[PDB]
Amino acid sequence: MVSKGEELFTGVVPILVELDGDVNGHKFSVSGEGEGDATYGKLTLKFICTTGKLPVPWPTLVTTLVQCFARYPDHMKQHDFFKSAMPEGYVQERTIFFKDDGNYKTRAEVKFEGDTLVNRIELKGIDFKEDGNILGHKLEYNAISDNVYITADKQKNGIKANFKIRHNIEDGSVQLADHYQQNTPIGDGPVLLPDNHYLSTQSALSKDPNEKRDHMVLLEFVTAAGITL
């Protein structure tokens, strides 16, 4: 038997992303468009900073800027919280701690508007160092790849996740970003609460050679794993 939300991801689905941010009083907005194909766990997106120059490095915003596009293997389909919450959607909140520097706090709503999957985000960043790796733009425009560790939060009818991203710094060192995540459903309907597992995620960053606005092109693959059969 196929689930309710799962049917909405059987083809290629268009994606819109909108972010409003404020980091140490530098206000900025990002808009993104692309497509997701959950059969393959594949996302292709382009993001543009609509207010001018982005005041933080693009790689720092990747995790914030739609885990419902994860490929869940057939034997793990009963563990896909993200699709089960659709089309009504879910709230995704994070705190992201940059080691020896500031933190981002994010809140997003992820839901369908008609045929389009929308991710609407507010981001607040505080306590960043003006000469640090973030505000000082010392991070490599480099891929990021890691595992998102998911567990159920039966108390909230949702999930929690934790993971670390290691951003490469221009001098060969690493800037750690510790992520803490909570997702909760927006609707009242039932959702699937998973056993422990993870999402193996890889994001490749590139540029559009014809684009003069400050932008990021992204190709991403996301696959669920860690349960055995």
Domain positions in the chain: 1-229
**Sign (positive or negative) of CA dihedral 160, 226, 42, 88:** negative
- Cα gap 186→88, rounded to integer Å: 6
Alpha carbon 215 to its chain's center? 17
If you search the block for the tokens 């705190």, which residue do you land on?
95
Asked if residue 138 lies in contact with residue 169, where contact means CB atoms within 8 angstroms, the answer is yes
Resolution in A: 1.7
Cα–Cα–Cα angle for 100, 204, 175, rounded to 5 degrees:
10
- Cα gap 139→137, rounded to integer Å: 6
Total Cβ atoms within 10 A of residue 156: 13
Residues 6+ apart with CB under 8 A from 147: 163, 198, 199, 200, 201
- Tokens encoding 57: 């490095």
- Tokens encoding 65: 């800027």
1-229: CATH class: mainly beta
Q: In terms of residues, how long is the chain?
A: 229
- Tokens encoding 13: 């689905």
Query: Would you list the DSSP string of the chain?
Result: ---TGGGGGSSEEEEEEEEEEEETTEEEEEEEEEEEETTTTEEEEEEEETTSS-SS-GGGGTTT--GGG-B--GGGGGG-HHHHTTTT-EEEEEEEEETTS-EEEEEEEEEEETTEEEEEEEEEEES--TTSTTTTT-B----EEEEEEEEEEGGGTEEEEEEEEEEEBTTS-EEEEEEEEEEEESSSS--PPPPSEEEEEEEEEE--TT--SSEEEEEEEEEEE----
Classify burial at 139, counting beta carbons within 10 Å of its beta carbon; exposed 0-12, middle 13-18, buried 19 or more.
buried
Per residue, the 3-state secondary structure of 54-71, as one string, reads CCCCHHHHCCCCCHHHCE
- Cα gap 189→25, rounded to integer Å: 39
Structure obtained using: X-ray
Before 87, cis peptide (omega within 30)?
A: yes
